[model samples]
Target: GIGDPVTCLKSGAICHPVFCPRRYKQIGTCGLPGTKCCKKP
Candidate 1:
């Protein structure tokens, strides 16, 4: 909820963490810990 959803959207992804799913890839980082930008194709 407190992550960089803006940049994540740019990569056609979303903000998340708990570790991205197997299908999702770690594209970038967010503005807080335990969160990241996960992109799914």
Candidate 2:
């Protein structure tokens, strides 16, 4: 997923960004490999 799963963030929960793919330099949610990018704080 690109953004947080829940609407509200927990006390320790945070947002983060992940690089697109190895070929691309874009960063948002999904990254390289067969998995999407996730954020945490």
Candidate 3:
């Protein structure tokens, strides 16, 4: 519905696959699944 998906790296805070910020970050749906966020790198 919004941006791409993200992954919570063990060394990072919030990161997105497409490269976005933490604010606009949301829960991922497809690819990577619910294990990541729609946030920044």
Candidate 4:
């Protein structure tokens, strides 16, 4: 499943990016710099 790369649209704390075999749904960003990919719940 190829989805859009995750980004930090909002801000709160420093989150980490969990990698996957396939592209998961971009829920949010990794709360860092640039475009960090986050997964859906």
Q: For residues 1-41, could you state the per-residue lDDT of candidate 4 as single tens digits?
A: 32233223332322445543344444444434334454543
Q: What is the lDDT of residue 22 in candidate 3?
A: 45
- Ranking 2 against 3 by TM-score, winner: 2
Give the whole-model CA lDDT for all candidates, comma-separated.
Answer: 0.62, 0.31, 0.43, 0.39
Error of 1 at 14 (Å): 1.9
In candidate 3, which residue pairs get closer than 3 Å at backbone N, Cα or C atoms, i.e. clash?
Answer: 15-40
lDDT of 4: 0.39
Off by over 4 Å in 1: 1-5, 32-34
Query: Lowest lDDT 10-mer window, candidate 2?
Result: 25-34
Task: Candidate 2: list runs displaced more than 4 Å.
Answer: 1-4, 19-41
Query: lDDT at 2 for candidate 2?
Result: 32
* Model 3 CA deviation exceeding 4 Å by range: 1-21, 29-35, 39-41
Better of 1 and 4 by lDDT: 1
| Model 2 lDDT per residue over 1-41, tens place | 23433421322223344333343321233223223333342
Could you give candidate 1's per-residue lDDT for residues 1-27 as a string of tens digits? Answer: 322456666666666666677687755
TM-score ranking, high to low: 1, 4, 2, 3
User: Candidate 2, clashing residue pairs?
Assistant: none
Best by lDDT: 1
